[PDB]
Write a protein that binds this ligand. Sequence first.
Ligand SMILES: Cc1cc(=O)nc(CCn2cc(-c3ccc4c(c3)OCCO4)nn2)[nH]1
Ligand SMILES: Cc1cc(=O)nc(CCn2cc(-c3ccc4c(c3)OCCO4)nn2)[nH]1
Lengths: 193, 193
Amino acid sequence: DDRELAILATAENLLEDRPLADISVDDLAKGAGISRPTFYFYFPSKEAVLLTLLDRVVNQADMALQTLAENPADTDRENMWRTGINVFFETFGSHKAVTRAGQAARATSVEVAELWSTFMQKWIAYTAAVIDAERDRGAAPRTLPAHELATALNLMNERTLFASFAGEQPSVPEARVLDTLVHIWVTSIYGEN
Amino acid sequence: DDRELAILATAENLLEDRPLADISVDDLAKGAGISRPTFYFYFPSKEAVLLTLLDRVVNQADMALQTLAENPADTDRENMWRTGINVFFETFGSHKAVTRAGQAARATSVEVAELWSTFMQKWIAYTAAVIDAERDRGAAPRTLPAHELATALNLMNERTLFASFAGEQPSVPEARVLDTLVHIWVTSIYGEN
Ligand SMILES: Cc1cc(=O)nc(CCn2cc(-c3ccc4c(c3)OCCO4)nn2)[nH]1
Ligand SMILES: Cc1cc(=O)nc(CCn2cc(-c3ccc4c(c3)OCCO4)nn2)[nH]1
């Protein structure tokens, strides 16, 4: 545990300053206070270290959403969506360097792409289930297929949060992105036609 | 012109089968019926060939949007947005291999990233201008800042169209993506609160 956790913490700290390609196994070993061959005991590559960091951040979001999902529904519909979107905002926003490196790795790592895809499918399925339950309650109109609406809104959040965190041009400023996403989710879920 | 256009057509044809990394200068030269050194006359790298292909596709979309933007406004608001989103759907959807390769290159090419960023900023600015004009006409409510709403909706379209064209998991099916995006644009622009 001890040495594994030091490698992960070292990697998260160095990713704040430079991309994974500019971080060496020696940097990771040195920061974790172990030798290079001892590193190779705990991980095969710096790529494996990033996969584990991303797995931890994604599971932290998923666990926080599970906590919310299994509590009573907020009776204010806008606040119910805002609290859930905020789990992603705070969780990924608290790990920007891992977020940035992980989104980059989706192009070069089938494991990173698979991890991201699995969790997106879960979050989309859960979004769709809540939309469906809102329609059954008569709170939301029967407009688009709930699963297709959930997919586009989750993909919006993926792209828009990422752009905000990375300060891309174009991007919504980070202090405006939650309100912007909640508006679009609430109008598109509750909006007639 | 002749030999430049053959190189571009060869490159677009080969990108339908394999990524740029798996295409050689010899493949491009051979398909364009020229020698390797003659290729280097027209382009420094296969990376430069992709930049030119992406520039052509992006300018084709931009010219088609300009054509629409300077014609009279469709008096049906849903149809006005649908026709504009459809320019991106048809244009990028007609050049999926260049779209896929270009989005991949944004990570490795500052020129590709700059080209994509410039055009996204233009399209977001134009979206925001139309929202603002709808609010001035009393057709749309004064909700979110128009430029922030435009940014999230354009980023949604970037991510969602890309995912559909690439058949990513998750994705909206290509036959459903236009209706899905138009619903979200129209409810979020015209929707009160
Ligand atoms: C089964 C059930 C029905 C119901 O109507 N309310 C709940 C609990 C309320 N709730 C909502 C969420 C939630 C809200 C927004 C989200 C989200 C989760 O994940 C993806 C991003 O958007 N988590 N818990 N549970
Ligand atoms: C200045 C003016 C005001 C007005 O209200 N109507 C027009 C013309 C109508 N129009 C709309 C668009 C259009 C619609 C949707 C779009 C889009 C363009 O680009 C980004 C994707 O979404 N192009 N032309 N012109």
